[PDB]
Amino acid sequence: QLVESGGGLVQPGGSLTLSCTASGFTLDHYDIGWFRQAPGKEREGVSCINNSDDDTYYADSVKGRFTIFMNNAKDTVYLQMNSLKPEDTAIYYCAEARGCKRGRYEYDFWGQGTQVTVSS
């Protein structure tokens, strides 16, 4: 049971910080993935934090621009998005992604996600 926020309208080159929260409940016991679904495109994995092996994964398209992390609270998983591009325009969702396994499509999405729009 995860809840996304932090979306909005941003100019190309700009920055947003998304959040994924389970409200006091501690997420550091789970592996969490960020996903997005853009218009005309299929659902895609963006980033994943592996809390069992203390590791992080990124799609080739966002490498070096996006960072996934938690703070001390440990109840929220953040997605820092830098140098945003139009191709990043999408609804962003989080979900449990055990082991951040790269070849999986089906996840349990309980959130409404949060919309990110990148335009001039």
Author numbering: 3 to 122
Please give me the paper's original passages concerning this structure:
Since most of the described Nbs have conformational epitopes, we investigated the molecular mechanism underlying the observed high-affinity binding by solving high-resolution crystal structures of BC2-Nb alone (2.0 Å) and in complex with BC2T (1.0 Å). The unbound and bound BC2-Nb structures are similar and can be superimposed with a small overall RMSD of 0.4 Å (Phenix structure_comparison). The CDR3 loops in particular have similar orientations, with the exception of two amino acids (Arg106 and Tyr107) that are flipped almost 180 degrees. In the unliganded BC2-Nb, the β-carbon of Arg106 is oriented towards the core structure of the Nb, while the Arg106 side chain interacts with the backbone carbonyl group of Glu108 and with the π-electron system of Tyr109. The β-carbon of Tyr107 is pointing away from the Nb and the aromatic ring is involved in a cation-π interaction with Arg45.
In this study, we provide a detailed structural and biochemical analysis of the BC2-Nb and its interactions with the peptide epitope, hereafter referred to as BC2 tag (BC2T). Similar to other nanobody structures, BC2-Nb features an especially long CDR3, which contains 14 amino acids and is stabilized by an additional disulfide bond formed between Cys102 (located in the CDR3) and Cys50 (located in the framework region 2 (FR2)).
